[PDB]
Write an enzyme that holds these catalytic residues in place. Structure first.
Site, PDB file in Angstrom:
ATOM      1  N   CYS A 214       4.816   5.944 -14.845  1.00 45.79           N
ATOM      2  CA  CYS A 214       5.265   7.320 -14.692  1.00 45.79           C
ATOM      3  C   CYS A 214       6.482   7.426 -15.595  1.00 45.79           C
ATOM      4  CB  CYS A 214       5.527   7.711 -13.250  1.00 45.79           C
ATOM      5  SG  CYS A 214       6.488   6.546 -12.286  1.00 45.79           S
ATOM      6  N   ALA A 216       9.704   5.981 -15.082  1.00 42.62           N
ATOM      7  CA  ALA A 216      10.246   4.630 -15.099  1.00 42.62           C
ATOM      8  C   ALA A 216       9.177   3.547 -14.931  1.00 42.62           C
ATOM      9  CB  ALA A 216      11.301   4.486 -13.995  1.00 42.62           C
ATOM     10  N   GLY A 217       8.007   3.887 -14.398  1.00 40.83           N
ATOM     11  CA  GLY A 217       6.957   2.894 -14.202  1.00 40.83           C
ATOM     12  C   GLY A 217       7.169   1.939 -13.039  1.00 40.83           C
ATOM     13  N   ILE A 218       7.704   2.418 -11.916  1.00 39.88           N
ATOM     14  CA  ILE A 218       7.877   1.544 -10.754  1.00 39.88           C
ATOM     15  C   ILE A 218       7.484   2.236  -9.458  1.00 39.88           C
ATOM     16  CG2 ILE A 218       9.626   0.008 -11.755  1.00 39.88           C
ATOM     17  CD1 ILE A 218      11.799   1.623 -10.683  1.00 39.88           C
ATOM     18  N   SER A 221       3.725   4.434 -10.052  1.00 38.16           N
ATOM     19  CA  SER A 221       2.954   3.313 -10.567  1.00 38.16           C
ATOM     20  C   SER A 221       2.866   2.193  -9.543  1.00 38.16           C
ATOM     21  CB  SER A 221       3.576   2.784 -11.859  1.00 38.16           C
ATOM     22  OG  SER A 221       3.600   3.804 -12.853  1.00 38.16           O
ATOM     23  N   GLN A 261       9.616   3.212  -4.858  1.00 41.07           N
ATOM     24  CA  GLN A 261      11.022   3.607  -4.929  1.00 41.07           C
ATOM     25  C   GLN A 261      11.585   4.185  -3.631  1.00 41.07           C
ATOM     26  OE1 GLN A 261      12.075   5.277  -9.256  1.00 41.07           O
ATOM     27  NE2 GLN A 261      13.386   3.855  -8.083  1.00 41.07           N
TER      28      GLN A 261
END
EC number: 3.1.3.48
Length: 296
Positions: A214, A216-218, A221, A261
């Site tokens: 996405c 930030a990819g955390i 994702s 997150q």
């Protein structure tokens, strides 16, 4: 067991504490390449970096750095590359990684603009006749077709190594109605989307790892990969009860920091896996119920 644990944690309103315990026990590994001065402008968020041991290296001798992590799930036999939304100067790196890693699919979980801010460069072409050429990595990218549904879009892209002129079809799976804040109330649209990705062959082992991001990819994702891997594990043994979501998430967090997150994303992950279990269990008709409730 998973549904029992869910209700127990729910009725007790302890999702924040559960999620915080995961934050505390999560692996800590060095990110030294990510932090080198020559890479500051390859990172979108200074608090989101790939560990050195699991980072994707570009096959170049100048600078091999990209903010991307290989998440290799040994038991589940599935690998994923999680990455940040490309920056204006890393779009070539991004497609170079896709090429070098032999990935077949890219899963994008964000919109380009969210909360009035640019979350992601426009890294793929929006019009067939306006192809993109990334001069640094010598790659050419052409929009081939587009299939817009109500909450996600599937794009067929052709990626060409301009050095060797070989070409590959990439499938772009773009989930567009993740809410600006919070998580989705129901996971049916999410699961219908995951199964679309699964049915495309993008996740299968004869291809390189799927690329998931996405901004930030955390977070999103993280949710995508955790639900997929959890469902995959229940499938290999058909033991809903044997899959521990939190231990799967901690295993994933060995390969990239920060996966999932918020506590509500953790809770939603549970929802998705529990509901997705209704397909894994033998109730094949539940997939078409999600397609109805999703309004695709």
């Amino acid at each position: 067991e998973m549904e029992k644990e869910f209700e127990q944690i729910d009725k007790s309103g302890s999702w924040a504490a559960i999620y915080q315990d995961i934050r505390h026990e999560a692996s800590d590994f060095p990110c030294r390449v990510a932090k080198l001065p020559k890479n500051k402008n390859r990172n979108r968020y200074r608090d989101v970096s790939p560990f050195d041991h699991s980072r994707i290296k570009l096959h170049q001798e100048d600078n091999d750095y990209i903010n991307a992590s290989l998440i290799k799930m040994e038991e589940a036999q599935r690998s994923y590359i999680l990455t940040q939304g490309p920056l204006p100067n890393t779009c070539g790196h991004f497609w170079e990684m896709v090429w070098e890693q032999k990935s077949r699919g890219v899963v994008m979980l964000n919109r380009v603009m969210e909360k009035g801010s640019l979350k992601c460069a426009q890294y793929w072409p929006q019009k067939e006749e306006k192809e993109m050429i990334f001069e640094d990595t010598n790659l050419k990218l052409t929009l081939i077709s587009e299939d817009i549904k109500s909450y996600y879009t599937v794009r067929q892209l052709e990626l060409e190594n301009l050095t060797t002129q070989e070409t590959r079809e990439i499938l772009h799976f773009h989930y567009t109605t993740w809410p600006d804040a919070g998580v989705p109330e129901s996971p049916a649209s999410f699961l219908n989307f995951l199964f679309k990705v699964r049915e495309s062959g993008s996740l299968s082992p004869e291809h390189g790892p799927v690329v998931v991001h996405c901004s930030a990819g955390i977070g999103r994702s993280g949710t995508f990969c955790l639900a997929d891997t959890c469902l995959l594990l229940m499938d290999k043994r058909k033991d809903p009860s044997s899959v521990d979501i939190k231990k799967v998430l901690l295993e994933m967090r060995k390969f990239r920091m920060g996966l999932i997150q918020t506590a509500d994303q953790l809770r939603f992950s549970y929802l998705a896996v529990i509901e997705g279990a209704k397909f894994i269990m033998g109730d094949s008709s539940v997939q078409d119920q999600w397609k109805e409730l999703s309004h695709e």
